Structures are given as structure tokens and as C-alpha cells.
Structure 1
């Protein structure tokens, strides 16, 4: 029951996130899908892996919400991504923090999200479980990559779409320091924590080569 509930939650919430226009709503649906993945991990009898994913998600999702809040405040309390255009150069620190957080969220290798999400996918691929739940989890991973792409493309890449009076500003030490601490965390904490904790479950040493790369392929 836990596995099925988690799978349907992650698929449904990623599907909802795939087409939202409020930035906060997109990040909230991403949070819900990650929670569904955590419940899927619990269902396949891997509690320590779920706790590790909790720890990594904390870092990178909190940084993502801080970057969204920075954009919202700088654009005069505007939250719709239809009305934010070219911010890649207009505010570069939020851009780089958001890119790094999106890469960690999508399980880019050797980042904080790698050490949890990659192991989750490998564990669900090699267990006596539902086929439907496995397929839903894979589609959810693809949709995670897809909605991260949506956020970046509609918030940073195009031409500006905000009102003419430009009040863009990042130069506040409080914002920069608060974001950069969790940036360093979302780069290194996965490696540090994974190397520091004792082993709590049997590893998946030998897997088919196509099955080892499935998370990267779907992403």
C-alpha cells in the first residue's frame, strides 16, 4: 500500500507540475513528487535510503525556494513565470544557484541529489515489486527533469517580459550569504554524509549496464 500510494503521488504531482505557471506552485508540486518518491522507498523496505533522501532534499529544495523568493521580491511581488523573462544576466547569482539546485534535483552525478535519488532508482529497479509502480517512478523522474527545464526556460532564457521600471537587485549580503551556504551544502553534503555514515543495507554491486544507467537515460 505504501509503495502504490507513493508511486501514484509522485506521478500525479509531477504531471500537475508539468504545466503550472506560478513558480511557487511548481516548486510545491516538485516537493510533493519527492515526498512520493520517499514513500516509494519506504515501500520497498529501504528506510535509511529514504532518510538520506530527506536530508538531501532539505538542502536543495530549500535553496530552490530561496531563489524563487529572490526573483519574486526583485520583480515587485510577481509570481507568474509568464511575466519574467531574461534574468540569466540581470541577476546572475540567483541564476547560478537555481541551475545548481535544479541539477541536484535531477540527480546530476556527484551532487547532493545523486547519492539518494540514484540509489532509490537502482533499488526500485532490482526488487520484487509492482511493474506499474516502477513505470510510474521512471515517468516521474522524466517529468522531474521536464519541469525543472520549464522553470529555467521560462524564468531565465527568453527576452524580458516584466514591467518597464526595472528594480532588479541582488546586492544584499544577507540574501547572498543565506543562498551560498545552502549552495555549498547542495554541492558537497551528499558526498560528506554518504562517506561518513556506516553501511545500513546491502548494496547493489552487480546490475545490467542498461539498468544502471536508466536514471540518467530518463532524465
Structure 2
């Protein structure tokens, strides 16, 4: 229904993952390779690896629900992206995602310590965790297609209301400080 907008979304989502030789690769998995080859805080390293895999997870949710499925919007469809301003704006940025990762990396002077000699197994973990994240997130998202009755998991609850953060943060000290004020 929205070819160019969907096309741009896939490009942007893939950049979030860091597909090789694309804009995402020239920064992100270079960091993950860099963070592996360092004296890090052990538990700090693991969380990023869980995080970068988690980057693909919500990325599927965007592509899965919004595009890959049957329509669910109100009946009167007003889908339209033919406006030149919309096309030109996305087009200008979209070429910046296909390129400018190679362009900047080559153009900038080489001035960082290069991690050249790593054992193979952690060299491409960024591709593993994303593909692993891609595979299971798709299966779990497609599990919604199954007619099975849903059971509200308490872990899902913790994630959905933002780690219970807003209702303690944005309710308790605000009340206490304002209560002390009056």
C-alpha cells in the first residue's frame, strides 16, 4: 500500500541492525568488535550484546505489525505518499543511509587504534545476535497469528508500562515534595 515508505522503513530498520557495508555497519558492530577487545566491566559487556540483539527485536515489531499483515485501519483508507515534498525529503535522507557510512569512514583520517587480530568466534557476533534476534522475534510475533488464547505474563506487564518506572518516579517523589510544600 505504501511502497516507498515501506522501502525507507526497511532501510532504516536494517541500519539499526547494522547490515554489513551499510550505514549501520560502519559504526555499530565496529563498536561491538571494539568493546569485545577491551578490559570491560564483564557485566557491562553482556548487556550490550543482549541490547544489540534486542535492537532487532522491536525492529521486527515495527515491520511486522505495521506492514506485514492484513489491514486493520478504519475502512476509509487515505493512504497517500505521492506528495513531492514527502518523497524528496525521504529520498534525500535515504541515499544518506545507503551511503555516507563508507564515505565518511574512508574520508576521515585513520586515527583510532585498529582491532585487527581477534579470535573468529566473537568477530561477527553482532550479525549472530541480530539474526538470532530476528529469528525468534519473528516466531514470537507470528505466534500472535496462532488462535491460541493469550495469557497476560507479569514479565510482559513489567516491560509494557516501562519497567514500572513512570508510576513510582512520576507519582511518589512528586507527591512527597509537593506534600512537604503545603
The TM-score normalised by the length of structure 2 is 0.71
Is it true that 1:124 corresponds to 2:32 in the alignment? Answer: no
- In structure 2, the residue matched to 1:164 is 75
Give 4+ residue runs of structure 1 displaced > 6 Å after superposition.
none
- In structure 1, the residue matched to 2:99 is 188
In structure 1, stretches of 5+ residues that fail to align are: 1-89
Following superposition of structure 1 onto structure 2, how do residues 139-178 of structure 1 map, counting pairs within 5 Å? Answer: 139-178=50-89
**Superimposed CA distance per residue, residues 164-215 of structure 1 (whole angstroms, 9 cap, x where no aligned partner):** 0111101100000000110000110100000000012110111111110111
Deviation at 1:118, TM superposition (A): 1.3
Deviation at 1:129, TM superposition (A): 1.0
Q: Distance in 2 between matches of 1:162 and 1:156?
A: 12
**Superimposed CA distance per residue, residues 132-151 of structure 1 (whole angstroms, 9 cap, x where no aligned partner):** 00000000001001110111
**Greater helix proportion:** 1
Cα RMSD for the two superposed structures:
0.6
Number of aligned positions between the proteins: 130
Q: Distance in 1 between matches of 2:92 and 2:102?
A: 16
Largest Rg, 1 or 2? 2
Q: Distance in 1 between matches of 2:79 and 2:62?
A: 19
Which structure exhibits the higher relative contact order, with contacts defined as CA atoms closer than 8 Å and separated by 6 or more residues? 2
